[PDB]
Amino acid sequence: PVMCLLANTTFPCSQPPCTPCCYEKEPEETLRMLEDNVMRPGYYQLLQASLTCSPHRQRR
Amino acid sequence: QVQLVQSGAEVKKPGSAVKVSCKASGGTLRKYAISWLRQAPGQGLEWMGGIIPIFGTANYAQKFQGRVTITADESTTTPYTTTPYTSTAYIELTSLRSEDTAVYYCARDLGPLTGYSYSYFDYWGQGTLVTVSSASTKGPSVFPLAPSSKSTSGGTAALGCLVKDYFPEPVTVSWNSGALTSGVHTFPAVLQSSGLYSLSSVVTVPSSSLGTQTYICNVNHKPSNTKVDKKVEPKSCDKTHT
Amino acid sequence: QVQLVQSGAEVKKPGSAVKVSCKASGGTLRKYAISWLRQAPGQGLEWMGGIIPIFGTANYAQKFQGRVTITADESTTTPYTTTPYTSTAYIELTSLRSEDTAVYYCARDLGPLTGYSYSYFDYWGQGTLVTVSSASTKGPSVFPLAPSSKSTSGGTAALGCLVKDYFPEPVTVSWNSGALTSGVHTFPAVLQSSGLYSLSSVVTVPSSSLGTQTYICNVNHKPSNTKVDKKVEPKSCDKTHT
Amino acid sequence: EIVMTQSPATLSLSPGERATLSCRASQSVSSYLAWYQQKPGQAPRLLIYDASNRATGIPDRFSGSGSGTDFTLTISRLEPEDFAVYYCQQYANSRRTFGQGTKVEIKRTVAAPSVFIFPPSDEQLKSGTASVVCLLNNFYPREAKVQWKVDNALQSGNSQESVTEQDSKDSTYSLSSTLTLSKADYEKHKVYACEVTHQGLSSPVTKSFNRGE
Amino acid sequence: EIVMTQSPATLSLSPGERATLSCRASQSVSSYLAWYQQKPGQAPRLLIYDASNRATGIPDRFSGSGSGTDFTLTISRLEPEDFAVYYCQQYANSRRTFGQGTKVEIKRTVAAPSVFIFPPSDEQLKSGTASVVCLLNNFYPREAKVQWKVDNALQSGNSQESVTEQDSKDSTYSLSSTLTLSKADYEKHKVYACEVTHQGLSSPVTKSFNRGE
């Protein structure tokens, strides 16, 4: 696989870094997930599935 | 004038996904939107979203975001084009629920061309049907309906037929292979509280001809290409027939 | 966003003049009008007139045309307006009558920017109260109030004071020097036909409180630096205060 | 939300009469309405765009009227081809919304229902099963109520209802209902006797049948 | 001229419920109308401009409609801080007119006034006059009327009234009224009486005290 970063941990660009549609739940640290994943090839193709769909009230 | 044509009707297991394809052609106008609407049978009529096939630019009614995606195909159409114009569009229905069972329409939307505003649905496809259920493709129970203990002459009395216990709804039926036409009512559908369908077909008559006439009916179904034919004479605890 | 600020309240003799003023700041828009409105508490809300401070060019309701003159600064309206944009606007009430006693508001008008059309008011100040009276500088007369059907035991559930014959409204009243802040009731004001103010205030105590604790009110006023206090315990026909 | 409404849920009239269908919205749509007719086994077709403009090749009979919150579609004299479902639609905001729809119906002289009933047959009885049918035939107007009333008691926990529309020649409706259980439960009774309550009948009607004959 | 009339001079409801304010325009304004609110000691704040645009600082607790002469402001649900004065205004014409306004009353269970009468004192009688203080306390609603009597002759003239705001944490209103007499006229009579009519009372109540008590 191709790998993400969150300083304490690393995982594939093909599983949720924390939770689905992260920015609505955790905004000012979702700003920081893109300071950690900042300049690598994988995560800009996981954003396609990580700021994408409906949580349990939000729809996009 | 103009026409739209779309995928044949389809049947699916819940929790899967399905894509409906649309094509439009022959109008003079170039850059209209194509839009998708849906209708649970007679229960409503909902606009879902659309695209402009030139720009992509997918646009959604908020109720469908996450449960659908919309796309269209760009083509090697030159700046001059010099043909009848054409477009191709889709809804991908995803994470299917049995409540998604509906007819889906493609329609032309003039919103972009009419000064980038909302518009009415100008021309429509045929519509196409999506069926969502876990059921297996069971062919019907096809027994003859028995006429009751006869009320006799001086009026009109019971005569008919019953079909039950099938999946895929598109059965058909025919009395005396079409030699009986008038007086036939066929009750269109029933849902048996767990995916299976049912149908009945009936012939209102004067009481003259029970146990006497060759009343006979065909039944036809698409699963396993099953086809059937039966007489409808009185038989229950005892019998009286032609 | 934006704010309007305006000069503090006024008190005046009939047949005198007033130069009320306001400032605007912090907006991205440069060419808004400044408008003046008023209400007396016994009236609705009325537009008087306004200006576009860059041009001058005042505009008035026919109720007020010639009763008032509206003007503005040269607002440093240079090219390279890259400093935050600000402006000052003034009104001149002249030879005023008792009926001109009202709150006057500065408010922002987008009418010129919305294609030179009449408009609603976008933002407001706090307003300037202007007071016209024949009266002159006075501190309060003050009185102790006797209990209803005086009993000094329990037959009533408030203990109170009366304040009368002052000028400028902002007397203020406090119970046990403000320590008894709970259970206070106070009533707004009345100008008598003599052109002077009055007020009433109470603590909502049972009459069993009398001498069980001591009960007082302390008053402050601004004119002549006048300040006063007294008991509210029984003081009328006889000295039975507890 | 902009809440739509069509006041007549149905309109019944004879050919040559003025049809007039009426629409409400909870706040001003200010034009931006359209009208459609819809046919069984088809997708809708456009009649009117804006408040009052006829769609492409729509003949003359239809006209649209209204403004703000209140609107109507009028047909000058209803032809025998025009009987259909009809919809208003709003496009004043991104939630484009259709009305509930209205059905337009041929008005005719009254006819009352005839009642029929049917036993099970050997293929069900060998399959552990019994199935029983109740019918109302060929009546107008159609607003009847029916129950299975077996040994006078309500049967419903196994039993469905179904309808058919005005026939194109006869202008009458019909109903079909089924009762179905294990063959051993079907023996629990002796008077299978379905009822009807109707507006063309003078009083409720019932017809009776017995298991084992 | 373009007179603006708001139909409720006052309105009442609990928090968490939808108030429906309305205005009548004397002649067509054709949109060009705005809605404001105000609190005492403050200038207004804008809520709505034209029929239905909210100002860019305003939450979805407010909404509007109207398209000629007939206008509505619908508050989606009052929070316990939206209880305020509300005004329409029009700008269709050079005479920009506001309405006379509407005040909303926070609805609660009733309480009748203890009406009282509170006698004057020597601190006032040393200066040629006497004030009697009828003092309707801690009551709801403020629909009370008050009237004054001296030796049972009516004193409706000088005996002015003043009312609290929606005071306390619960809008317990009060009223303070001040029958005021010259010293000689205070001494020429011996019975002072004051009378109240209110919705929370069963029927009118009079309270009295006598000179020299």
What six digits make up the tokens of D7?
């006041």
Nearest to E117 among C46, C118, C148 (CB): C148
Picking from C189, C186, C188, the residue whose alpha carbon sits closest to that of residue C178 is: C186
CA–CA separation, E83 vs E79, rounded Å?
8
Give residue E133's Cα distance to chain centre.
20
Technique that determined the structure:
cryo-EM
β-strand pairing of C46-52 with B197-203: unpaired
CA–CA separation, C29 vs D81, rounded Å?
61
CA–CA separation, D132 vs A5, rounded Å?
68
Q: Is the bond preceding residue D141 a cis peptide, omega within 30 degrees?
A: yes
N- to C-terminal Cα separation, chain E: 60
Largest CA distance in chain D: 68
Over chain C, what HEC string results? Answer: CCEEEECCCEEECCCCCEEEEEEEECCCCCCCEEEEEEECCCCCCEEEEEEECCCEEEEECCCCECCEEEEECCCCCCCCCCCCCEEEEEEEECCCCHHHCEEEEEEEECCCCCCCCCCCEEEECCCEEEEECCCCCCCCEEEECCCCCCCCCCCCCCEEEEEEEECCCCCEEEEHHHCCCCCEEECCCEECCCCCEEEEEEECCCHHHECCECCEEEEECCHHHCEEEEECCCCCCCCCCC
Backbone angles phi, psi at D185, to 5 degrees: -75, -35
- The set of residues, in sequence order, having a beta carbon less than 8 Å from that of E143 and lying 6+ positions away, is E198, E199
**CB–CB contact B238 D56 (8 Å):** no
* Placement of tokens 């809300």 in the chain: C45
Length in residues, chain C: 242
Over B120-186, what HEC string results? Answer: CEEEECCCEEEEECCCCCCCCECCCCCCCCCCCCCCEECCEEEEEEECCCCCEEEEHHHCCCCCEEE
Burial of E77 (0-12, 13-18, 19+ CB in 10 A): middle
- Beta-bridged to residue B106, according to DSSP, are B36
β-strand pairing of B10-12 with B18-25: unpaired
CA–CA separation, C147 vs C138, rounded Å?
29
- The set of residues, in sequence order, having a beta carbon less than 8 Å from that of E105 and lying 6+ positions away, is E10, E11, E12, E83, E141, E166, E171
Picking from E168, E125, E16, the residue whose alpha carbon sits closest to that of residue E78 is: E16
Nearest to D137 among B118, B204, B237 (CB): B204
Amino acid at D79: E
CA–CA separation, E63 vs E68, rounded Å?
17
R_g (Cα) of chain A, nearest Å: 11
Amino acid at D161: E
What six digits make up the tokens of B141?
């129970």
Kindly tell me whether chain C and chain B come into contact, counting contact as 3+ Cβ pairs under 8 Å. Answer: no
Kindly tell me whether chain A and chain B come into contact, counting contact as 3+ Cβ pairs under 8 Å. Answer: yes
Specify the DSSP class assigned to residue D41: T
Interface test with C, best of E35, E86, E87, E124 (most C CBs within 10 A): E124
The helix/strand/coil state of B100 is helix
Residue E177: closest C-alpha in chain C: C200
Interface test with E, best of D27, D29, D69 (most E CBs within 10 A): D27
Burial of C116 (0-12, 13-18, 19+ CB in 10 A): exposed
CA–CA separation, A14 vs A12, rounded Å?
5
Strands (E) in E52-204, as ranges, are 53-54, 62-65, 70-75, 85-90, 97-98, 102-106, 129-139, 145-150, 153-154, 161-163, 173-182, 191-197
Residue B69: closest C-alpha in chain A: A53
CA–CA separation, D129 vs E117, rounded Å?
90
Residues in C touching E45 (Cβ below 8 Å): 124
CA–CA separation, C52 vs C59, rounded Å?
9
For residues D198 and D146, the answer to whether their CB atoms sit within 8 Å is no
